[PDB]
Amino acid sequence: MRECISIHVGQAGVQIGNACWELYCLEHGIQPDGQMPSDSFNTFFSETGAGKHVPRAVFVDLEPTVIDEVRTGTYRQLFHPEQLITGKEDAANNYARGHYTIGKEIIDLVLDRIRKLADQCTGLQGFLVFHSFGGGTGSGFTSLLMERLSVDYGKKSKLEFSIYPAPQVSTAVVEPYNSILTTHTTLEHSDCAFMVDNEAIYDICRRNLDIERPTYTNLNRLIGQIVSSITASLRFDGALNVDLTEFQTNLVPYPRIHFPLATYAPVISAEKAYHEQLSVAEITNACFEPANQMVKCDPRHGKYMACCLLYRGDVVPKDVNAAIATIKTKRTIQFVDWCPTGFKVGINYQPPTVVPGGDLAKVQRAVCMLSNTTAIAEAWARLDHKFDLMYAKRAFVHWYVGEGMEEGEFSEAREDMAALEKDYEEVGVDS
Amino acid sequence: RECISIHVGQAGVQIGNACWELYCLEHGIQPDGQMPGDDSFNTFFSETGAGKHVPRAVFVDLEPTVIDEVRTGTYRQLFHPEQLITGKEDAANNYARGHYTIGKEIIDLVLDRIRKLADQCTGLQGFLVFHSFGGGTGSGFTSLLMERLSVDYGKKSKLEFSIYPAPQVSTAVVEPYNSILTTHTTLEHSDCAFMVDNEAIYDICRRNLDIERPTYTNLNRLIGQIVSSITASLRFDGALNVDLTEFQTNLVPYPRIHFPLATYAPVISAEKAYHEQLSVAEITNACFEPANQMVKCDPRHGKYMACCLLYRGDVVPKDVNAAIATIKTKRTIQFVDWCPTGFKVGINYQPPTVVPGGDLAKVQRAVCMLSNTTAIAEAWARLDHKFDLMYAKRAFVHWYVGEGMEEGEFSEAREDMAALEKDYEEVGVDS
Amino acid sequence: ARLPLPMHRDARAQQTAEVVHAHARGARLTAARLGRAQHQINGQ
Amino acid sequence: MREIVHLQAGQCGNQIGAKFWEVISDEHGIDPTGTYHGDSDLQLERINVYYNEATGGKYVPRAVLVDLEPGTMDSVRSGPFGQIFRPDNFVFGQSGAGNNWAKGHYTEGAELVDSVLDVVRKEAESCDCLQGFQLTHSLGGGTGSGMGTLLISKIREEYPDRIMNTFSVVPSPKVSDTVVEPYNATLSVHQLVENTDETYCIDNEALYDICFRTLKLTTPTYGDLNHLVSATMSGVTTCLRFPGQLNADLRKLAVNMVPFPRLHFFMPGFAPLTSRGSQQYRALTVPELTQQMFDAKNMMAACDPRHGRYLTVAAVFRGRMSMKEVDEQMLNVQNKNSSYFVEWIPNNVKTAVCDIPPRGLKMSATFIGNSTAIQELFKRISEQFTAMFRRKAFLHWYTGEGMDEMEFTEAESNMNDLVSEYQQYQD
Amino acid sequence: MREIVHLQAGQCGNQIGAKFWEVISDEHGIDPTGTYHGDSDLQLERINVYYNEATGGKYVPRAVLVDLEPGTMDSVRSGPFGQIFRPDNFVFGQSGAGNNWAKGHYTEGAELVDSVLDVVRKEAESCDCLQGFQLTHSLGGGTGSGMGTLLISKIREEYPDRIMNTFSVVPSPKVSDTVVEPYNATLSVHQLVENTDETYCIDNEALYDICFRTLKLTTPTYGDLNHLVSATMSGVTTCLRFPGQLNADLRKLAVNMVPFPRLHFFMPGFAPLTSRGSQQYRALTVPELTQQMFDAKNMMAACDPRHGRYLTVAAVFRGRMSMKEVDEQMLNVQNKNSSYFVEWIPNNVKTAVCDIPPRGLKMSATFIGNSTAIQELFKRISEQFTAMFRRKAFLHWYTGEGMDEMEFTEAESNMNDLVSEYQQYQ
Amino acid sequence: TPACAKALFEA
Amino acid sequence: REEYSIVHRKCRSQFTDLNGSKRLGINTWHDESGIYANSEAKQ
C-alpha cells in the first residue's frame, strides 16, 4: 500500500522509463509478458486476477516516433495500451508550443489516465516526474502538467528527477529560453527536485567504468540506480527505513530550497572489482567527492545544508556510524552553521541487482546520497549568462510570441530566478 | 605498520623493479601476487579477499616508455594498473619543464592516488622517496611533490635515498642545474636524505665481487639489499629493534644536517664467500674501510658525526659489542668530541636472501651503516665548482627562464647553499 | 608582516610553555613556604 | 497484588521491548507458545505482576504496543517470541510521524491517543492493586516522543497516585542519525518534568562503549544493545517478583532518590559483564560487583559523574549472598570519596538483596545513580537547539502543523531553569 | 598482609620482566600454564606477596608492563612464561620515542601516564595491606626513562608512605648503543633522586665481567644476563616469603641503610659464580660465599671501592645454616678494612638468614651496599654531557617539546652538587 | 597570589 | 640457496591493530592469548 505513480514526459522521459522499467522487472520476478513465474512489487506493479502485473506508469510524448518502439519492442505486453499517450506533431523546441498551443490537446487526456491510476492506490506516497529542461514537451507541457497537479491534488508529494541542460556540451540553440522559463514550475510546484546533466554522467562512464563511447543507454542505466535506491526502502525491508516523507522532512529546510544533489557510490567495473576492497567506509568516501558528483558543480565551494545517505546490502549500524565520524573530521568539507546534527541514515537489506548486458559489477554494498548545498548557485548563474547574452539582441523571441505568449514572461521569469540565486546566497552566510 | 614507497623517475621505475623482486622472494610471493596468516608483509603488501597482495607503491615517470616495459614484464599482474603514473611528454633534463609546466598535470593524480594508499594505513610510519637528481621528473616534479606533500600531511616521515651524480662520469651536462635547484628546495622539505654515486657502486661491483661488465640491474641488486635493511627490523623479530622514526632520531643533530652516507659490509663473491669466515668483526672493518664505501666521498678528510648499525643474521650481542670497542682503538677513525658514543644498534635475526641472477652467496652476517660525516662537504664544493664554471658565462640559462620561471631563482638557490656549506663547516671546529 | 609567517605555530607553543614552567615555579614556592609551615605545624 | 502495565512506543520502543519479554519469559520458564514448563514454584508464585492469565494454563503479557506505521509491527510479530502477545494490544496507525515531533504530538498522534486509552484502561482496571505503568521510547523519533509524551501528559491526570516510570533513549552526543533531532528532544523534556515519577537516561553511544571495550564482541547489534537495556529493566523490578532478605519496590527507590519533585533523571549500569576469554580470570566475589557498578565507564548514559556530585545512589543486588558483605562495601565507597557525594545527605546509598539470580549467572548486581552531572546533557541539547533556532532552519516543518514560535521560546526556558536548578544543589 | 606490585618499563623493562617472573615461578612452583605443582608447603604460605589469586587454583603476577611500542610487548606474550599474565596489564602506545627522553616525558608518554594510573590503582587497592612497589627500567630509552619517571613523579604524590624501589639500568662507559643516551639518563636522575627510596645500578659491563671471568660461557645472551640480575632481585625480597631466625624486609634493609633521603646508590653482587668444571670443586663453606662480595670481580655496577669507602653495607644469606658462622666471617675481614670503612658508623653490616635455599641449592649469599665510589659513576656520565652540550649537539630534537635551556642548565648543576654531596666522605 | 600571601601570614 | 624460513620472522601484532581484517574464520572476542604462529622459537 505504498504506491508511487510514475510519469514520463518527452523522448528523454520515455527512454529513461524504458531503463527503469526493465530494471524493476529483474529486481522482482516479472518477465516481459507480465507473468511472475512464482508484495514487494506492489509500490510499482499493480495486479489483475489472472496473475498479470501492470506498471503504474504513464508515458507521454507529442511525437509518435518515440513510443512506437515501446509498442513493438520486447515489453509491448507489459503496458496497458492506454498508458502510452502520443500526440501528432511535436512541440519542436518551443516552450510556447508545448505550454499554450500544442499542450492543451493532451492536457485533457493525460489528466484522466492519472485519475484511474490514482484511484487504484490506497496509500499513494507520491508521483515521480521524469523530464528534461531543454525540449519542447519536456519543458513546456511539464510546466502545464505541474500547474494542473497542484490544484487537482493539492498537498500531495511530487518529485522531479530532471535533466538540466549541460553548460557547454549541448544539442540546441533555443535551449536557454526553455530552461529559464521552466523555473517557476520547478519553484512553486515541486516538492523535491534533482538536476543531473549529461556531461557529468559522461565523466563517470569513461573514467569509473571502461565504456569509452557510451550511448544514452549507459546513461539511463545509472538513473535507474538512483531511483531504485531511493525507493527500495519502500519495497524491501530494512534495519532502518525512510519513506518519501521522511527524507524531505530531513533535507528541505525552507520551501524555496528544494534542490538536492544525487550520487551513487560504487560505480566500478568487473575488470577492476577484483582489486578494490569495497567496504562500507570505503564507498561513503566517494559520495562526497567532486569527481563522482552527478552535476558539474563542486560542493567544496559551498556549505552542506543537510545530507541523506541510503545504504544497501550487508551493512551494520556499527560500520555506518564509524565512517560518518571520519567524514565529520576532515576540514575539506564544511557543514553549515545551523546544521550540527547533520545527517540521515537508511539501512536496507536488499543488495542492488544486476542487469545483463549492463556495465557495473555485482556488489554487496552501495550508497545513494541526496545532499543539499549552497554550491548549486553556480549552475543556474552559468546559464544566466547564456540567456541574457542571447536575449540582449532579441533573437528567437518571434517564435515564442507568435505562439500565444506575451513577452513579459521573458523579463519576469528571468527575475523569478534572479531572486532565487540571491535567496540561496543568504541561507549560507554565517550568523 | 605501513611503509609506502613513492618512486619518482625512470630511475624510480628501474628501482621499482629490483626492490620489489627482492620483496617478492624475501616474502614468498608468486609473480601473480599470491603466496604458497603470516602478516610479516603488512608494511608493504596490502590484502584483498581472494588472497592477493598488491604493493603499496606508486611509480612516477614522465616518459611513457619506461613504464610500458613494467606493464608487459614478468610482474604484469602483480601491480594494480592505476599506481604507475606516466606523463605524455617527458621533461628532458630541465627543472621548470617538470617543475612548473609539465608536472602540473601529474600533480593532481598522484596527490589523489597517495590519499588512497595512505587511507588504508592505520599506522603509517613514513613514505619513502627514491629519485635521481638528473632528469626532469627526478628533479622538478620530485621537488614539486614534496612541497605539497608537506601541506597534505605536516609531520609525517619523508625519506630520501637519492642518486647524486658522480664526480667525473655523468649522463649529461645540465645535471648541475637540476642537482642544485633541488638541494636548495629539499632542505626544509626532507626528513632524512641519503646519497649514492653510481661510479662508487661501480668500484664495488667488479672489484669486490668477481663480475666485470655489469648493468644497472647488477647495481640495482645492491640498493635493494639496503632498502630492505632499514626496514629489516620492522618485518622480522629481533633481539633489539629499530623502526623508521628511531634511526633518524640518533642521526640528525640539526634539521638542515640530515644527510647520511655509508655502505653495506659483506660484498664478496661466491669464490671468496665459502672460503673465508665473515665474523661480526670481519664485516665492520669493511664498512669503515674507505675503499669499500658507497659514495665517492672519503671520510679520512671528515669527522664521523653520528652513526647507526644494522646487523642481520647469525650475530650475537657479544661480538657486536666487541668490535665496536676496537673501532675506538684505532686513530684512523676520528669521531668528533660533541658526539661521544655515536651508535645505534639494531640487531635483526632474519638472514638476508639471495636473488636469482644475483651475484653474492648466502652470508650469515652483515652491516649497513648510515654515518653522517663532514667529508660530505667535499661533495658540494665540487658542485659549486662546476655550476659557477658553467653559470659564469650564462650558459644554458635561456632554457629555464621562459619555462614559466624567473632568472632570480638561480641566484638565490646558489647563494643558499653557500651558507649551508658553512652549516657543514662550524660542526668541524671545537671550542 | 601583516601575513602569518610560513612557520611560527611552534613559537606559539614556546610562548605558552614559558608561562607553564613560569607560573609553575611561583606555585612551587607557595607550596614550599607552606611545606616549612606544615613541618613547623608538625613540630608544634 | 502489585501489577505493572507495560507501554512501549515507536520502532525504538518496540525493538527494545520485544527483547525484554524474551528476557522475562525465560526468567519465569515460559515457552514460545506461552505455556509454563519450569522446575520451581518461585517462578510461578509472583507471575501476576506482568502476565494476564489465559485459558489452558497459558500466560499473556500486560504490554501495549503503540506505533504510527505498520512495518515495525510485523518484525516484532515474526520474531521468536512474537506469538505470545494478544493481537488487540498491537496498535498502529497507517501514516508515519516522519521524524516530526509536531506531527505526532498535534496532528497524527492526537487521533491515535484516543484509541490507545481504551486499551490502557482495560489493562489497568483489571488489576487487583495497580503499582504503576512503564514506557520505553526514544527522544529522537516522532511517534516515540511526540505521541509518547502525549500519553504521559494524559494518563498522569487520570491516574495521579500511581507510578509512571520511563526508560528514555535520549539523543546521543556524538552519533546522530537525524538532523531534526534537537527540536524533538527539547520539546519533549519539558513534558517529562511535570508528569513523570522516575526517568532513566540511556544513550545508544554509551551502550556501544560497553559492547566493544568491555564485553568484547566482534559484531555488536541492536539485540546486543537491547539485551543491556532489558537486563537493567529486570533488575529494578525483581524484588516485586522474587523474595529477598531485604526488599525494594518501585516506590522505595523513588522515595529515597527523588528529594525534590523536579529531579528524576537517573543513570543505570550493570555489574557482571565479562568476556568469554576473560571469564576464567574474572567472576569472583561481591567486591567484584561493587567494583563494576560504580566504575565510570559502565554508565548507560554518556555523561560522567566525575564532573559533579551524586545526589543519591542506589543498588539492587541479585543472588543469595551475605547481608554483611553487601553492607560493608557501600560503607567502603561512601567514605573514601568526599566530593562525589552531596554534603547534606550523609547516607546516600540504598541497598536491596534479591535471592533468585539472573539466567545463567550465580550472582549479579544492578545500579541506579542520581547526579548533578546529568545537567550536562541539557546544556548540549540546548547548544544545538538555539544554534538551529537562531536562523530558523527547519521551522516550517513544525509551524505548519499547528504550532507557533513562542511554544519554542518557552520550551528552551523550561530547560534553561532545570539546568540552573541543578546548579544550585551544586553548592 | 604485605603485597608487592611490580613495574616493568620499556623494551629492556620487559625482557627483564620475563626472567624475573620465570625464576619466581620456579621459586614457587608455577608451570608455564600458571597453576601450582609444588613439592613442599612453604611454597604456598606467603606466595600472596606477589601473585593475585584467581579461580581454579591459578596465580597471576601483580605486574604492570609498560612500553610505548607494541612490537615487543607481544613478544612477551610470545615468551615461555607469557601465558601467565592477564592481558589488561600491558599499557601500549602507538609510536614511542626510541632513544629520546623528551617525547616520553612531555609529549608522547605524558598522556600514557594517565592510563597506567588507572591500572596501578586497581592493583593497589585490590591488595589488603600493600607493602610497596618496584621499578626496573632502562635509562637509555624513551619510554622507561621519559615516561617512566613521570610514573615515579606522579605515583609518589598519591601513595607517599609506601615503599618504592628501582633497579636502574644506567648506561655504561663502553657497552652503549645510543648517542643520545646522556640526555636520556642525566635528565632523569634528579627526577629519580628527589623521589625514590632505593636505587641500584645495573651496568652490562658488570654482567659481562661475571659470565666470562667467572662462569666461563661461550655465547651469553641477555637471557644469561637476566638471570644474574634477577638472582639478586629475589634476594632482596627473600624473607618476605620465607621465614628465618632473623628477618629482613626491603623496608628494614633501608632503615638501616638510608641515612639521608638522597643517599641511596648501591652496587650488588652474588655468591655462587662457579664454572661447570669448577662446580666440581665446591668446598661450599661460609668463607666461600662472603669473599666474592669483598672481591672486586663480582660487583654488578661498574664501580670500585678501591677509590672509595665501603660506607654502609648489607648482607642477606640463604640457607639453613649456623648463626655463629654468619656473624663470625663478617668480622674476620672487617678488621683489616682499615681505610675501607668510614669512622663514624661502627656497626655497618645488617644481616639476615633466609632458611629456604635458592632452587637447586643449599647455601649462597648476597650483598647490597652504599658507597662514595658511586659519585664517580655520575661524573663520567656528565663529563660526556659537558663534552656534548657545549656544542648544542642534538638540541633541535629537544627544544621542540617546549624544553628551555634552563632545564638543561639546572640538571647539570642539580646533579653536580649531589656528586659533591656524596664526595665529602673521601 | 595576594590571597596566598595572606594565608601564609595567617599560618 | 636458503628456504622460506619462519624461525626468526615475526607474526601478527596483538596490541597494535585490534580488528578482524587479519583473522580467518569467525571470531567473537579478541584473541588474547600467548599462542603465536611463531610459538616455536622456544623449541
**Between the CA of residue A48 and those of A4, A33, A55, A80, D50, what are the distances in Å?**
18, 13, 11, 12, 47
Task: Report the candidate in B248, B429, B291, B264 with the shortest Cα–Cα distance to residue B360.
Answer: B264
In a mutagenesis test of the B interface, which of A209, A271, A275 is the best target, namely the one with the most B β-carbons within 10 Å? A275
- From chain G, the residues in CB contact with E73 under 8 A are 15
Cα dihedral A235, A241, A247, A251, rounded to 10, equals: -140
Read off the C-alpha cell for B277: 669466515
Considering the domain architecture, whether residues A117 and A221 belong to the same structural domain is answered as: yes
Considering the domain architecture, whether residues A77 and A198 belong to the same structural domain is answered as: yes
- From chain E, the residues in CB contact with B342 under 8 A are 179
**Between the CA of residue E230 and those of B7, E222, E236, E247, E314, what are the distances in Å?**
49, 12, 10, 20, 18
Instruction: Report how far residue A59's alpha carbon sits from residue A80's, in angstroms, rounded to the nearest whole number.
Output: 11
Contact G27 D218 (CB under 8 A): yes
Sheet containing strand A84-86, edge to edge, reads A84-86, A57-61, A6-9, A126-130, A157-162, A192-195
Residue of D nearest to E60 (CA): D281
Residues 6+ apart with CB under 8 A from D283: D272, D274, E55
Instruction: Report how far residue B126's alpha carbon sits from residue B155's, in angstroms, rounded to the nearest whole number.
Output: 10
Domain boundary among A242, A260, A278: A260
Residues E101 and E394: beta-carbon distance below 8 Å: no
Considering only the beta carbons, identify the residue of G1, G9, G12 that sits closest to B236.
G9
Instruction: Report how far residue D104's alpha carbon sits from residue D405's, in angstroms, rounded to the nearest whole number.
Output: 18
* Residue written as grid cell 550568523: A431
E-assigned strand segments in B148-287: 157-163, 192-193
Please tell me what DSSP assigns to residue B335.
Answer: B
Please count the other Cβ atoms lying within 10 Å of the Cβ belonging to residue E253. 20
- Resolution (angstroms) stands at 7.7
**Proportion of chain E in helix, strand, coil states, percent, rounded to 5:** 35, 15, 50
- From chain D, the residues in CB contact with E89 under 8 A are none
Phi, psi of D318 (to 5 degrees): -125, 135
Q: What CATH class does D3-257 carry?
A: alpha beta
- SS3 category, G21: coil
Beta bridge partners of B366: B312
- The sign of the torsion formed by the CA atoms of E25, E26, E31, E35 equals negative
Please tell me what DSSP assigns to residue B352.
Answer: P
Closest chain B C-alpha to E217 CA, distance in angstroms: 11
Residues D182 and D381: beta-carbon distance below 8 Å: yes
- SS3 category, D239: coil
Instruction: Report how far residue B309's alpha carbon sits from residue B324's, in angstroms, rounded to the nearest whole number.
Output: 10
Quote the CATH superfamily of domain D265-374. Tubulin/FtsZ, C-terminal domain (3.30.1330.20)
Residue D138, annotated as binding a ligand: yes
Read off the C-alpha cell for B240: 633489539
Number of domains forming the structure of chain B? 3
* Residue written as grid cell 516522519: D98
Instruction: Report how far residue A155's alpha carbon sits from residue A127's, in angstroms, rounded to the nearest whole number.
Output: 12
Considering only the beta carbons, identify the residue of B50, B119, B120 that sits closest to A274.
B50
Closest chain E C-alpha to C3 CA, distance in angstroms: 23
Cα dihedral E234, E236, E242, E244, rounded to 10, equals: 150
Task: Report the candidate in B164, B103, B136 with the shortest Cα–Cα distance to residue B296.
Answer: B164
* Residue written as grid cell 634528579: E190
Buried/exposed code over A324-333 (b: 16+ C-beta within 10 A; e: otherwise): beebeeeeee
Instruction: Report how far residue E199's alpha carbon sits from residue E262's, in angstroms, rounded to the nearest whole number.
Output: 10
Read off the C-alpha cell for E242: 620465607
Read off the C-alpha cell for B377: 662537504
Residues 6+ apart with CB under 8 A from A275: B48, B54, B80
3-state secondary structure chain A: CCECCEEEECHHHHHHHHHHHHHHHHHCCCCCCCECCCCCCCCCECCCCCCECCECEEEEECCHHHHCCCCCCCCCCCCCHHHEEECCCCCCCCHHHHHHHCHHHCHHHHHHHCCCCCCCCCCECEEEEECCCCCHHHHHHHHHHHHHHHHHCCCCEEEEEECCCCCCCCCCCCHHHHHHHCHHHHHCCCCEEEECCHHHHHHHHCCCCCCCCCCCHHHHHHHHHHHHHHHHHHHCCECCCCCHHHHHHCCCCCCCCCCCEEEECCCCCCCCCCCCCCCHHHHCCCCCCCCCCCCCCCHHHCCEEECCEEEEECCCHHHHHHHHHHHHHCCCCCECCCCCCCCCEEEECCCCCCCCCCCCCCCCEEEEEEEEEHHHCCHHHHHHHHHHHHHCCCCCHHHHHHCCCCHHHCCCHHHHHHHHHHHHHHCCCCC
- SS3 category, D103: helix
Instruction: Report how far residue A180's alpha carbon sits from residue D204's, in angstroms, rounded to the nearest whole number.
Output: 48
In the structure, do chain B and chain A come into contact, i.e. share 3 or more CB pairs under 8 Å? yes
Please tell me what DSSP assigns to residue B35.
Answer: -
Residues A139 and A131: beta-carbon distance below 8 Å: yes
The β-bridge relationship of strands A345-348 and A365-373 is unpaired
Considering the domain architecture, whether residues A241 and A324 belong to the same structural domain is answered as: no
Residues A199 and A166: beta-carbon distance below 8 Å: yes
Please tell me what DSSP assigns to residue B209.
Answer: S
Task: Tell me whether G38 touches chain E (CB under 8 Å).
Answer: yes
Instruction: Report how far residue B89's alpha carbon sits from residue E415's, in angstroms, rounded to the nearest whole number.
Output: 65
In a mutagenesis test of the C interface, which of F1, F4, F9 is the best target, namely the one with the most C β-carbons within 10 Å? F4
Instruction: Report how far residue D316's alpha carbon sits from residue A172's, in angstroms, rounded to the nearest whole number.
Output: 78
Considering only the beta carbons, identify the residue of G13, G14, G33 that sits closest to E83.
G33
Query: Which helix (H) or strand (E) is E66 found in, with range?
Result: strand E66-67
- The sign of the torsion formed by the CA atoms of D396, D398, D401, D407 equals negative
> Residue A63 sits in which domain range?
2-260
Alpha helices in D117-164 (DSSP H): 119-122, 146-158
Task: Tell me whether E54 touches chain D (CB under 8 Å).
Answer: yes
Alpha helices in D372-423 (DSSP H): 378-388, 396-399, 405-413, 418-422
Contact C17 E406 (CB under 8 A): no
Residues 6+ apart with CB under 8 A from D166: D134, D135, D136, D137, D152, D192, D196, D198, D199, D200
Instruction: Report how far residue A254's alpha carbon sits from residue B242's, in angstroms, rounded to the nearest whole number.
Output: 59
Residues D37 and D94: beta-carbon distance below 8 Å: no
Residues D169 and D138: beta-carbon distance below 8 Å: yes
Residues 6+ apart with CB under 8 A from E394: B253, E179, E180, E183
> E-contacting residues of D 278-307, CB under 8 Å?
278, 280-281, 283-284
Contact A275 B119 (CB under 8 A): no
Read off the C-alpha cell for B356: 636469482
Longest dimension (CA), chain C: 63
- SS3 category, B210: coil
Q: State which approach was used to obtain the coordinates.
A: cryo-EM
Give Rg (Cα) of chain G. 13
How far is the first Cα of chain E from the last one, in angstroms, to the nearest whole number?
42
Residue E416, annotated as binding a ligand: no
Considering only the beta carbons, identify the residue of G5, G8, G11 that sits closest to B39.
G11
CA E66 to chain CA centroid, nearest Å? 16
CATH (domain of B83): 3.40.50.1440
* Residue written as grid cell 539523543: D171
Read off the C-alpha cell for E290: 662472603
Beta bridge partners of D36: D30
Identity of the residue numbered D162: R
Task: Report the candidate in A10, A374, A380 with the shortest Cα–Cα distance to residue A180.
Answer: A380
Active-site residue list of A: 246
If 0-12 CB within 10 Å is exposed, 13-18 middle and 19+ buried, where does residue E306 land? exposed
- From chain A, the residues in CB contact with D384 under 8 A are 340-341
Q: How many CA atoms lie within 13 A of D62 on its CB side?
A: 26
Task: Report the candidate in D280, D302, D282, D303 with the shortest Cα–Cα distance to residue D292.
Answer: D282
Contact B239 E94 (CB under 8 A): no
Considering the domain architecture, whether residues B43 and B191 belong to the same structural domain is answered as: yes
If 0-12 CB within 10 Å is exposed, 13-18 middle and 19+ buried, where does residue B281 land? middle
Instruction: Report how far residue B195's alpha carbon sits from residue B372's, in angstroms, rounded to the nearest whole number.
Output: 11
Beta bridge partners of A58: A7
**Between the CA of residue A45 and those of A20, A130, B228, what are the distances in Å?**
13, 18, 64
Considering only the beta carbons, identify the residue of C26, C33, C41 that sits closest to F8.
C33
- SS3 category, B105: coil
Quote the CATH superfamily of domain D375-425. Helix hairpin bin (1.10.287.600)
Read off the C-alpha cell for B74: 614478468
Read off the C-alpha cell for A406: 506575451
Q: How many residues does the structure list for chain F?
A: 11
Residue B138, annotated as binding a ligand: yes
Read off the C-alpha cell for A38: 512464482
Residue B323, annotated as binding a ligand: no
Longest dimension (CA), chain E: 63
Please tell me what DSSP assigns to residue D295.
Answer: -
**Could you confirm whether B407 is annotated as catalytic?**
no
Contact E86 D281 (CB under 8 A): yes
**Between the CA of residue A220 and those of A75, A214, A289, D277, what are the distances in Å?**
17, 11, 22, 54
Cα dihedral A162, A163, A164, A170, rounded to 10, equals: -170
Identity of the residue numbered A166: A
Residue E138, annotated as binding a ligand: yes
Query: Which helix (H) or strand (E) is E240 found in, with range?
Result: helix E238-241
Buried/exposed code over D287-313 (b: 16+ C-beta within 10 A; e: otherwise): ebbbbbbbeeebbbbbbebeebbbbbb
Instruction: Report how far residue C43's alpha carbon sits from residue D359's, in angstroms, rounded to the nearest whole number.
Output: 61
Q: Structural domain boundaries of chain E?
A: 3-257, 265-374, 375-425
Please tell me what DSSP assigns to residue B104.
Answer: T
Task: Tell me whether F3 touches chain C (CB under 8 Å).
Answer: no
Considering the domain architecture, whether residues A330 and A380 belong to the same structural domain is answered as: no
Considering only the beta carbons, identify the residue of E77, E80, E83 that sits closest to G14.
E77
Instruction: Report how far residue B200's alpha carbon sits from residue B262's, in angstroms, rounded to the nearest whole number.
Output: 11
Considering the domain architecture, whether residues B173 and B237 belong to the same structural domain is answered as: yes
**Between the CA of residue E300 and those of B409, E17, E168, E274, what are the distances in Å?**
62, 18, 11, 16
Instruction: Report how far residue A196's alpha carbon sits from residue A295's, in angstroms, rounded to the nearest whole number.
Output: 5
Domain boundary among B230, B260, B290: B260
Task: Report the candidate in D372, D363, D387, D357 with the shortest Cα–Cα distance to residue D418.
Answer: D372
Please count the other Cβ atoms lying within 10 Å of the Cβ belonging to residue B405. 17
Query: Which helix (H) or strand (E) is E9 found in, with range?
Result: strand E3-9
Considering the domain architecture, whether residues B424 and B275 belong to the same structural domain is answered as: no
Residues 6+ apart with CB under 8 A from D199: D165, D166, D168, D192, D264, D265, D266
Q: How many CA atoms lie within 13 A of D203 on its CB side?
A: 24
Task: Tell me whether F1 touches chain C (CB under 8 Å).
Answer: yes
Closest chain C C-alpha to E397 CA, distance in angstroms: 13
Instruction: Report how far residue B48's alpha carbon sits from residue B33's, in angstroms, rounded to the nearest whole number.
Output: 11
Domain boundary among B375, B396, B415: B375
Closest chain C C-alpha to F9 CA, distance in angstroms: 10
Residue of B nearest to G24 (CA): B37
- SS3 category, E292: helix
Residues D52 and D126: beta-carbon distance below 8 Å: yes
Please tell me what DSSP assigns to residue B188.
Answer: T
Query: Which helix (H) or strand (E) is D92 found in, with range?
Result: strand D90-92
- SS3 category, B312: strand
DSSP states along D7-50: EEEHHHHHHHTTHHHHHHHHHTTB-TTSBB--S-STTTTTGGGT
What's the angle, vertex CA D303, arms to CA D298 and CA D308, rounded to 5?
Answer: 105
Q: How many Cβ pairs within 8 Å bridge chains E and G? A: 35
Identity of the residue numbered A57: A
Residue of E nearest to D336 (CA): E125
Residues E269 and E313: beta-carbon distance below 8 Å: no
Task: Report the candidate in D185, D173, D177, D422 with the shortest Cα–Cα distance to residue D302.
Answer: D173
